[PDB]
Design a protein around this ligand. Sequence first.
Ligand SMILES: O=P(O)(O)Oc1ccc(OP(=O)(O)O)c(OP(=O)(O)O)c1OP(=O)(O)O
Ligand code: NA
Length: 115
Amino acid sequence: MSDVAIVKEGWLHKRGEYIKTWRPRYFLLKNDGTFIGYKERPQDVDQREAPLNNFSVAQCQLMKTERPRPNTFIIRCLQWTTVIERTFHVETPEEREEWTTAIQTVADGLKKQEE
Ligand SMILES: O=P(O)(O)Oc1ccc(OP(=O)(O)O)c(OP(=O)(O)O)c1OP(=O)(O)O
Ligand code: NA
């Protein structure tokens, strides 16, 4: 049960892929590697069951950049059978570190869970 527990949550900007833009999103990282985003913080169970974005951070790559926006981090991960890169930015390097440290820790936990 605590496998589906929330490890970290908060606001961040998700980068456009083919369009230059930053979309505001509220993301929750769960202990089973699920990383889900919403346009606003989910108020209830129903709002939680309808995420706009949903990635798995198992075995991901975590990169940190300052261009074009400072405090940006990139995640290279597997969406089913396709490797994808998603880009996010937060307000401070302190929060970026909280996010990349939380993500890596979860990935390491899933691996060690192959126990
Ligand atoms: O695969 P995801 O990261 O879950 O979703 C994407 C992916 C690509 C999008 O196209 P783009 O507008 O960013 O070029 C894209 O933008 P779009 O579908 O909303 O036009 C995505 O949806 P979202 O960022 O608005 O939630
Ligand atoms: Na689009």
